[PDB]
């Protein structure tokens with residue numbers, strides 16, 4: 001299984017977050033609706049090298065399920081391959097990748113610096129299956145792992161957040177925070 005370990009790296013890489021999508025810092029958890037815009041901010045302390053790329057991948061949070069590949073349920077599976085949970089919208093250079101050994105899916109875009117008038121780079125992710133989809137995530141928590149990689153694919157930085165894809169993000173966040 002791919003590592004989830006936070007690695008700020010040489011460029012001081014971290015994530016930020018701004019109901020269709022809501023983030024709980026206390027839980028390090030995003031709650032979002034299926035197919036809706038999920039803004040994830042990339043923050044760096046120094047400019048990454050030319051051709052730096054940003055990869056997103058989902059894994060199960062629980063150790064006992066970590067070897068299982070996160071993919072869309074049969075119903076939802078039937079630019080993006082239909083099996084992929086995570087898509088990117090609003091980007092002309094999206095790559096959908098299937099690992100030849102692990103079969104794990106990921107979605108990659110080029111790293112771009114913040115637009116003029118901004119301090120961070122935003123990527124709009126879409127999650128295409130609900131956490132509750134049986135025959136898929138089966139209510140089991142997932143993590144999204146965001147990796148900053150150089151042009152050769154080498155690790156520059158890593159961060160992660162838990163995700164629940166659900167009908168009522170605000171309500172579920174409140175419940176999970178009360179728990």
Ligand SMILES: [Zn+2]
Pocket residue numbers: 072073074075076128129130133136
């Ligand atoms: Zn589904």
